[PDB]
Amino acid sequence: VNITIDLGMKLSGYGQPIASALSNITLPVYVHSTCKSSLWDNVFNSDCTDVLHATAVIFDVAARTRTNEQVVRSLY
Amino acid sequence: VNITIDLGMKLSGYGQPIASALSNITLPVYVHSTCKSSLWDNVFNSDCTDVLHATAVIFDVAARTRTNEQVVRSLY
Amino acid sequence: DQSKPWNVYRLPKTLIPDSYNVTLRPYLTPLYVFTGTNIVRFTCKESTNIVIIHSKRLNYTSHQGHMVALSGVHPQPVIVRTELVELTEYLVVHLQEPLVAGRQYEMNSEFQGELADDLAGFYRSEYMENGVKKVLATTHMQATEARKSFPCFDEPAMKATFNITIIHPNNLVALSNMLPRGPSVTWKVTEFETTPIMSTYLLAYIVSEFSYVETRAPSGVLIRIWARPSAINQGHGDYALKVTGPILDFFSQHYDTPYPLNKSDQIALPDFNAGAMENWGLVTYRESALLYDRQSSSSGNQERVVTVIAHELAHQWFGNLVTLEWWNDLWLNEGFASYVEYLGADFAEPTWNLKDLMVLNDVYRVMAVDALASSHPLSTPASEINTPAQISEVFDSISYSKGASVLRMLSNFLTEDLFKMGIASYLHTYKYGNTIYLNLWEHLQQVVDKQPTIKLPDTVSAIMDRWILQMGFPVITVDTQTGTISQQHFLLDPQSVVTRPSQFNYLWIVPISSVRSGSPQAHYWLPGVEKAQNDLFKTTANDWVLLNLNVTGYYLVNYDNENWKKIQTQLQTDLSVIPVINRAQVIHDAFNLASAQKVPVTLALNNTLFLIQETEYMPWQAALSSLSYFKLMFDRSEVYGPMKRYLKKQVTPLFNHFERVTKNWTDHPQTLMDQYSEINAVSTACSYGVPECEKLAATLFAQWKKNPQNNPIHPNLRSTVYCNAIAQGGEEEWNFVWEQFLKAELVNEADKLRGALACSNQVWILNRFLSYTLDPNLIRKQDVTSTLSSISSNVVGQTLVWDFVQSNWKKLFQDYGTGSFSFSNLIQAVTRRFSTEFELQQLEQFKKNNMGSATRALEQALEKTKANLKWVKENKDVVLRWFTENS
């Protein structure tokens, strides 16, 4: 149904977008992706910028960035 | 007629192909381009490599490289 | 004149106190001073016509013509005279008639002292809060400083109850050992409940304006953490409160004795040079070691917090409930705490594997100073400590670290259960009393004799005599061709002469475990003879042995070359067979034996070849600690070329490993050991020119500089990133870091920035930094020497710092050589690269042109320079050949 994925994105030490494993999935078949950025303290209180922008895709739920796709969680 | 252009190519101090103004044109309308490379001493005794490869194009006769075209001479 | 009893440093055994009534009234308004009144109730065990009581810098008020008044509890004594003896810090009262034995007497007095800025007795601490300056009144009365606050029998064996009363302004709050008796009613009076039977040096009371966070354990103990209101509001005291409870529960179960008191207050002070004091019921810390900030603190700070809390809470049973009879047994107290803190911490942090760090923190730290001919035994007769300076002399690193090591060894060869049973019996038998180490040995022997499982070659006291009565530790040499085993007194200097006699002729009774190709063997005892033979140490061409498992014994181990080669082959084949502690042990022992010219240095270098596949922290830490001397001796010569290369070759995989583990440095490990390993990997990779580490540091520094408000760099990596970015960059990075340092409010971040500022490769920048160090507005005085040492660590800054010190000798000596040991440490730190004859001649010329303690420091530097010159001349060619062949 209306499945929502809250992705968490971080900027790596080399300056690359990395999809955090702390992303959340809600199952209360449209998919709604909400992106949140954070720092080393793992506090997702900032909206994602252009660089750290990913779309939730789908089994394994992954985050498609502008250059790659990274597996976040598994909906088993 | 059978116009031949002997282009002279050099590698710049930044590592870029530069078309030397010492290129030669012969008029004894097919165009035949022959590429020769050299060093700071201006001795075109080496065949052009892949990087320093240019094709003579056409008025002004120029040298089209893989990334740009540089005017070599003028056939006025 | 020892005939007069008031000329003897030891208090007479004629009068025994029972209870005290102390009333104090600090005057925080300035010439800061305090006034008070005191009542002492004592019993005369033997008839005497004189009363002697400790007193130090107290002005008394005349009472019927005399300083103090005396009465019975009635043949009232007549005070013929009363005087002060400043040499022995005494107050002598002469009575016209001898006191009747078996009768109790009360002495009243009224006195006025000073609240000075020296951390002794009842003093004052001035700090800066916001833009204002605030003053608090606190006590540090350890050892022989309770006499400075009120007249008392200031000896640990003199135990009495105390009734404390404080008079303080309404705007302040007062803390003591016990709970207040009720509400405090421009001045208020606070009274506290009667303390149990305790010693004078364990008392404390503090008047200040502080906030607290409180909790209650299921056992009913009220735990409070006190700090400045800002720190409490920011939540900097939450971790200490969280970990205090589990540690108290662990110590209650381990000692098999409930917590003796009802409350547990721990207070953090902005300025406390002592570090921590184990006052009964009111523990005092420095705020840099008790408060934890989850936004700017690294893992080392958290480990320090938990370990210091465990160490100070261990004293509540062992040290306060049962106290030492005299200051010559202090090693037994402190060392015990220094051993059990890890255990307590291991209970609070089960996943940190803290008990493995103790070796690196203690054993290897003390073996450096215990392997010298200038060492001293743990135990000395009580008659050799009478002067307060002699009393203060026993608080040294030997008493802590080596005491912890020997107690750990004793606990290991007696098993934990028997050790705990003996400790519990000892605590139960002598509660609210004083003891000597012989009583503990007797209790342990009683526990041992009641079980048939464990058998010892001799009694507990006989075994411990070898380890507490003579200095040093043995080296045990094993020949596996025949299985012969021998022991010898180990010294770092092969040409050293020991002039301190020993009653055992430097022979120990040694407990020895071992494995055979990873399979445990039977426990063995070296019986105190020079040589012996056994088949536990005889091997064929296939198997090998390794003795000191987990380094539970306080000795070094040496093998024959074939056994070393087999061990190296096993390390190159499968690391997991050999425990990680022993993997660090082989490196440490090989380097120490090479320094003593017992094995070639090439063997020590061969022992480091397995680090290319090692991901643990302790072997890397041991190897880097050993190779620091090589780096100091060879960083300005041709040997530095290959050596760096070799280290790079060794460190490239480890870094790569973490680069894969951390997901390009986004997620960081949660365990302490893995975090230490990651810090080591990043630091070593950036120090020896790995391009990925430099790129990481540059990118992180750029991210930080883009948004200085929020630091994107994890606190574990900040120092390495800052130093590497400054080293790679130029004036812009240095200026940015300097501007950040100037506006820094915290202490850890400011220290990290100041340390990073010394990594510059430009001569003019370093000279400008040296010029900055002369201004107190930019660099604080208490940091100046540290800064210099950091600038001395740079290979470019060695000559600059030496010239700066030579040019400013008088000012530096005046500012840091009056009563502090920081000047000697600065002199030692700036001369440790000297290994050439030209440098030796220059140092000798400087000494000749500069003729107190400065000359002694120069002489020690000259001796160290001569030793370094000899070592370099002896080892340069072979180490260069090895590094070229193995890089």
Place this chain on the structure above:
Amino acid sequence: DQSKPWNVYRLPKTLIPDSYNVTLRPYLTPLYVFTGTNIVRFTCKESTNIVIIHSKRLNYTSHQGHMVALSGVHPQPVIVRTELVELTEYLVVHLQEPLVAGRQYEMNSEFQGELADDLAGFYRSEYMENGVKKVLATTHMQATEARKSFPCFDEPAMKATFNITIIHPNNLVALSNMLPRGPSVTWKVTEFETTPIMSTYLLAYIVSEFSYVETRAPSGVLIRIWARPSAINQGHGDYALKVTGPILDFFSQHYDTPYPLNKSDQIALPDFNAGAMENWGLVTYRESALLYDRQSSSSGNQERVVTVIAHELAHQWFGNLVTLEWWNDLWLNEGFASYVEYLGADFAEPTWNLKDLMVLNDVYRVMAVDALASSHPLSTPASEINTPAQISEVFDSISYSKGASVLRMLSNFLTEDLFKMGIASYLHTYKYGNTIYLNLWEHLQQVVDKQPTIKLPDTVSAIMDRWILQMGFPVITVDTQTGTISQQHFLLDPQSVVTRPSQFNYLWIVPISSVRSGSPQAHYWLPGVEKAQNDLFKTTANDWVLLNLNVTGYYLVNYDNENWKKIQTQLQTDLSVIPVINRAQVIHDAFNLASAQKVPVTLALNNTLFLIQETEYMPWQAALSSLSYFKLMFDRSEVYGPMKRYLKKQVTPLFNHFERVTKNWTDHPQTLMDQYSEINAVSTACSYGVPECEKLAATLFAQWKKNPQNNPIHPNLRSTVYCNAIAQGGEEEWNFVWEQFLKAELVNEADKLRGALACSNQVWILNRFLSYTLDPNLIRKQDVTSTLSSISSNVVGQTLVWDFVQSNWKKLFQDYGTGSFSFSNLIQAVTRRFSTEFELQQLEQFKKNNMGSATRALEQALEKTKANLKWVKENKDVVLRWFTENS
């Protein structure tokens, strides 16, 4: 005892030689020696009974009992005795009867000398060809060294014809001043034609195995270039042969006299420390200054070749055709050549604008040493030069550079046509004779008096007396508010005391040109008075003046502040109005006046603000030469921060300009000035951290390292690229450059690589280089000091080099202080950064602990250090403020 004529250093005026017959037979087979026979024909002007003739280290053979034989051309003299006076280098023959006046006599002798390794007289030179060692026999008989080869009247005023004969192996060839008389017939005899009337010090003959390239001018002169056969085959002598002809034609037209001889041979020697010698018909050069390689030589080498050829070919008329009467007028000869070489070179290279470089090469080079109280005048009486050491003392930089400057000024204010006419008359009148400068002054005065156009304030000799009889030069101060003009003796030290008296009281008669806002004015003469007034120097609020046009006068110029501001505004508005030589002059004069505390240093710094839009070479060169002292004094302090920034801001456009002109560094300029400007731009941009220059250097070094066989880097940029790549990189670049240096066959490339090896920023690499300098197999002895100086130029290597020199003082003094001035230059080069009291105290302590010329060098270094300390303490704050405000 001056009564005896053989104790007088000056030869008697009694005997005059007419012709010589010299026969020589070198023995290249080794104890190398040579033998010969000699015949001297002379006339006795006055009757005498003694014969004195120069002779130095010649073993004679007995002829009838005496060393030499004498006969008439017959009252045969009887030789009573013959002896050698070693002090005056004489051979004295005593005759029983006085010689008859008006009669000619012949003296025969047979002698045997040594072919030593010292470059004096007839000596030997040993060089390495391929893998073998070869020996040649050559002569350097300048000054007073022809007596060392054969007995002669060795004075320049003694002129005679010569007949030379050589006996040499068949495998060798022999060269002399004249053409051989015919074919040379295991030994061969070569005879040469009779020389014209010439002096003894101009003779030369060389026996060697050399090849030559020949050509014939349209005038009929055969021009030959001689060198080693390998160099001739490779074509390294083509440029010299090409340029020799045009220079000879120019000198034939300029002197208005044809070439006196028939052939012109120029020979390059592998080892010739003298540089070049102007032997008549056979000029000798060092191969590093005569041979040009079109594959590895830069533009500086080509300019040096053409200028040295012109300088040596100028002597064929002025110096050889007409010679000095005595060694006290040498400044007239050398200086003249030092002025005309550029002119000759300007004819050979019309597009190089060489005549503008002379200032930078000569005037500004000599004003540094002529502005000291220790200077000396150009002209001295002949009676003050008698000792050969005194004769050698006159060959100093003053005689060359200041002589060239004064002769250039004289030529400019007399116009070129009149100067050439006077020179031609002087050459025609005194051909094959000797002169003094008064004769040249008289000829110039005669030419001046024969024309009405040019008018002088006095005679030529009266004007030149002010410039040749007193030391120093004036500074001319102009006040434009009133038009007043004054002159003063200029000294660099404001607190210097001049103790050398002057007959003119240090007042000159000064020729002054000027422009008014770019418009020429009328020529003016300062008449030898301290102060004067004229309306040529009075300006309104709009116009400005500038005096020394093209710096044709040997003096400094100072203005009032308003005129300086107007000049600076004009420079910021339009550069083209002011000539480029004067654009360099303003900077040079401002800095020199600031050093003398006549103008504030801020004015000198303001004068450099126009360089941000300057694309010429001379102003940049002058500014960098002036700022080298600032860089030396401030490269280890806080002033180095802003200063570099400012220089970067000034150099960024110029670099960009050439980046656009050269088409990303592919096509390089063809004119000498543009090439110098490009070299300056690249060097300055890379030295002060311009990222584009660093990227260019890294890319070029990578291209070179990819294919070491062919060097893709243009020879003009090789030094900068190598040094910058080594500075940016690490051990790999340094090792590559070191390996290239070890296998280098040429000299210029090896020198460039060795200089680049000293740009490393690593302490251990620099220490390893210092260790390498101790091995003669790696670094040659003759380069060692130079290498040290280069390592001293690095700010990191200053302390390392100073410590190395202090540690190896004795060996360095033994190897380079025995008879060479290289040790003094090394001492001066390694101590020029000393500006602090600590460094001064250390230097004084070293001097006290090290007590010949070494102590004098240390004392001079102490004085320089004191001056530097005072200057830094006086200027640091203001220069820091200026650099911060203008960066």
